């Protein structure tokens, strides 16, 4: 155990889920999970292990923001055994063409936070996925007729930034979407050799006014879902 | 009526204590509070509001790591008139006689993140308290005949650093506690005009490697709760 | 002696008020200070060592400028026993509600400067006051009839500042005023082991562009002068 | 014309193959292409344009570094329809399980250069490569019986690094290969909206300069440009 | 031989004029060298040592841009015995009264490059000429009736530039010229224990401005190159 | 008049000899020139104004330090019609080569301090000199038979290093001499359009043990004097 899982190796399987609301977590392992299993519930922050169509999947949530995710992926590679971590999150989007409900497939992450540069003697570390994984949600896509594109997103430290002339960079820059783990998550993934991918479904439009029904924000977190389990099948084989 | 807080104007009283951990915001509730009712469960981020020898309090956790605390902490700030933000939350200990369950009071707060440069040109902002909260809390412990010591905390990005020696350079100028959350809370104060105060708990020291159980961070902390709860009795006077 | 003092240890108190005018030192040491003795004169940064009340008391300019007090308060911290330093300065206000002649509490210092980078890996030090030192000025203030706000000082390496703009964002996180020294001696202090506190009576506003003369700087700011010196007899217990 | 290239649209293909050194640019278009013609010699810096089973490609030189390589790419996107840039380089390993001869995709270039920061408000740009050719790059070194490694590149701006440390910073986060140039282009492309990606065969392992006879140098080089080209055919369908 | 440069000693004089261009370094040879033959053909960057008025002079193309120059210069120094580099090329002017084919000598050149804050513990470097060599250019500029401007050149890493604000400030600081190698090869000077310096003619005015005009100077290309081997005549004696 | 400087247009002269402590200045002042009349003494920072072999010449204390010479060097500028500023001063040593005798003439200033980075948008100003001011130093010296050297200063905010990384660090790059004040009058003369120079001479030399009586320091500290006001009147030609 460590002091923020109460679970012990063995509890996991190798490939974790990790959505950043634990509810969905929930959500998740009750949905389209076999005998799930509750295995953390330390702060909240609920973790689940089971089988999908006789794989071994477990689901947790990593709590929002860079520092939060790098604690449990960090400890899940660590001390569970964990291979691949897969972020099934929200993100905002800046491009014109990017509409909600999109899915969206960081091959790489940017960030404006300190992170990478302490880990990296202040220089440019490119926080990116694990290729194969990005193959693997790809292909799991086209296999459900979902559409979705691959690049750049943007991991954010403040959800409320004072700095908005930021978000005319991102779009110059051709970030799909502005979330806050992913370049956190693939520095831990680098830093302790695991691999990791995120995956987001837009679930706003920075500057731009326009909602959704509760019913379709839920079935494009399904896809979300199930482009992620599928891909680990893939993974597998 | 916010994006992280489903709960509306009056809900809260217009001072929170806000651990990191939505559950030891449940216990104090449950311990500290009378009539407390739950008043926020988005994302399992517990808050609940009560009375304390009369006074309307709320307790609420703010998550992980500064993004997590500078959202919830902006939005009860500018969404549903909180005045105060007390943190009450555990720290790593790097001076030799700094002992567990030793409660510190952060007038400053270090920083390894980027969010206040940000804010701040680039240049350097002293993340600190309010000077009165400081006065309340060491009043308050010296009353009910508690030690506090008074200085800097740092609040680290990364829970586990890749640069070992950052800690002989905490322990060098004094940092009387590591922690994640400090420098944000007090970045959220001043740039959306509000006081906040961070009291810890040691619940780990980063040398002897003597720690703590996630559920004695969870619930037996009380010291610090006692401390910030009569604190805000003297801030009313 | 040291470099930039010719003295011996003894010759200071274990207290020393430091303007950054010599000039000023000399005005508080023949005003307020009985039996003075003059103990520095090297490169005319005056010292002084007299009684106050019957308690043992020195005061001494520090020069203009980070660089400079940094030299002086090392120095008397090393060599000369000396305990806490009381930096007694001019600043500009920035704030509308801030007046000419008011006295502000620098219970931190952000800073323009690189020296607490230097110091800190690169990461941000909250240079801020002793806590104690800056209670007994409030409660010295307080008994004295004077008004004092606490808070974040800005210490700028370059008075004559080519960003204009950094003034709007001082202003907006709550800078009291704008000096050159503070930042600098707290960050001595935590890393030699003792003891600060800066107080500044406002001598220019940069909005209202109200001034006054350097006569005025030099002698005539004696509010923070009794403010200090009274706190510093509280300090005794 | 461009200031750097003395040709006119038509004169190449919308796909430029890019090796540091001119000489093998004209060694690729007179082992590889059909008809090739010399259509750039402006600062020795020869590009050739040709076909490849019927294919219109190009092959110039970018010179060596960051800077340089930004230059061409750029005035070949702005000025010569060029939508699609492969460098084809060789590159140095850190990694003892990453052997001489290996084929190294840079799904993501890490750099110690200033260019992206720079573009993206001194944030982390993520640099990386467009996915489709990565992935059309990973299927044309399967077919030819060819295993590739995907991951990051790390641009270095010095050759003679005055700090070997920072070899074991790249070593311990994963990085494949070191090369001058990928996130140079990576930046231009993101920047004037085309598409890049970098292709290294490993040359020389850095930590015990161990490296290889021309004659298999020669054969891996030749693989590599196999790869590159039956990219581009893959992409077109 | 090293990397990049296939001679031997001796091949080389002890000073190397530089242009950028490898065929501007042909065009030298034989229009100022007697008994002008090639020692180098590594990636077409040519090189060549002849005789001017007896004395040993060699002259190289160095590339384009920081990473590039750095190359050829460090080899020249570390295994060719060269003592003596003078970089010989075109900058762009943002000062009005800067005209063209003005000659500016860089005693000293400023950089948006990271490669001399990598070198200098990420402080400031003042990457400087010579002062003899300067002198030496001044000198032999009067000679032939020049008179070259003196002061700072500005060493970009993008000749595309997405940031035409920082030629204002440019402009501001008196910069002379605008290029792309000078502070790469005073790095290199320094750090190996050589002698540099670099000479440019005035090609064109970078931006517009309503109080650009000033005039011409029939300086020619020619006249630079006269400039600069004539001034390593007068450093001879 | 302006806040540090209790004088009017006209008291100065058009050039100003600065060292860094006042009492020199008073000392230069009543030896080598005529009719010396003192026109400062705000902040006891002595300011002088005399005649020089008949031309007209003042001399000033800067204080130590950057942010101290920079306000006294701008105000100089802006206020007091004042063109060229001379700093004469002392420096430490870091190169073997460079004897405890030394006169060294600072044509370049490298720093640690950050006011040129807020002035040039976070990159590298090379802080220069004024080239014939230079020059003028070189040649007074030679006509006394004094050899200057020519070359970088290190311009340190820190006296007291808090971990001295730096001085190997200046030793391998060449630096000539440590200071504290020569990158930030370069500066300042850069910003305001002034010609500054930077003569000091060597007052301590780490690893050896070299002795003067002082008979020689005397007789050098004068000797620089001279060749800063032998310099002015050669300028004058
Ligand atoms: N040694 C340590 N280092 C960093 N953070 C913490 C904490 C707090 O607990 C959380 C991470 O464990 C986070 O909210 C942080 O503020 N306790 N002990 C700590
Ligand atoms: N508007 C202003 N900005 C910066 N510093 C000062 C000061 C202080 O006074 C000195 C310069 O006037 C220096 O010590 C500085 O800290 N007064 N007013 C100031």
Redesign the interface.
């Known amino acids: ?1 460590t ?2 899982i ?1 679970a012990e190796m063995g509890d996991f399987a190798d490939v974790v889920l990790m959505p ?4 969905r977590a929930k959500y998740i392992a009750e949905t389209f999970l076999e005998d799930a299993r509750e295995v953390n519930n ?5 973790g689940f292990t089971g089988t999908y169509k006789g794989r071994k999947i477990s689901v947790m ?1 990593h ?6 995710c ?2 449990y992926t ?1 400890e899940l590679i660590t001390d569970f055994g964990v291979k691949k971590i897969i972020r099934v999150g929200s993100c905002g989007a800046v491009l014109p063409h990017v509409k909600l409900r999109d899915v969206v497939i960081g ?23 694990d ?2 994984m ?2 693997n949600a ?1 292909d799991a896509a086209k296999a459900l007729g979902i559409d979705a594109r ?3 997103l943007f991991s ?8 908005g ?2 978000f005319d ?1 991102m779009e ?3 970030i799909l979407g502005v979330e ?1 783990e992913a ?1 956190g998550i693939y ?1 831990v993934a ?2 302790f ?1 695991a691999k990791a991918l995120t995956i987001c479904t837009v679930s706003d439009h920075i500057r731009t006014h326009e909602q959704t029904t509760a019913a379709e924000r839920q079935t494009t977190f399904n896809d979300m879902i199930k482009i992620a389990l599928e891909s680990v099948l893939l993974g597998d084989k």
């Open positions: 155990a002091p923020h109460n950043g609301d634990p509810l330390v702060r909240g922050m609920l949530g709590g929002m923001g860079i520092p939060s790098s604690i960090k091959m790489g992450a940017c960030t404006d936070s300190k992170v990478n540069r302490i880990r990296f003697k202040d220089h440019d570390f490119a926080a990116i996925a290729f194969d990005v193959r790809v691959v690049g750049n954010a430290d403040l959800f409320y930034s004072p700095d002339e930021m960079v110059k820059y051709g806050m370049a520095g680098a830093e050799g």
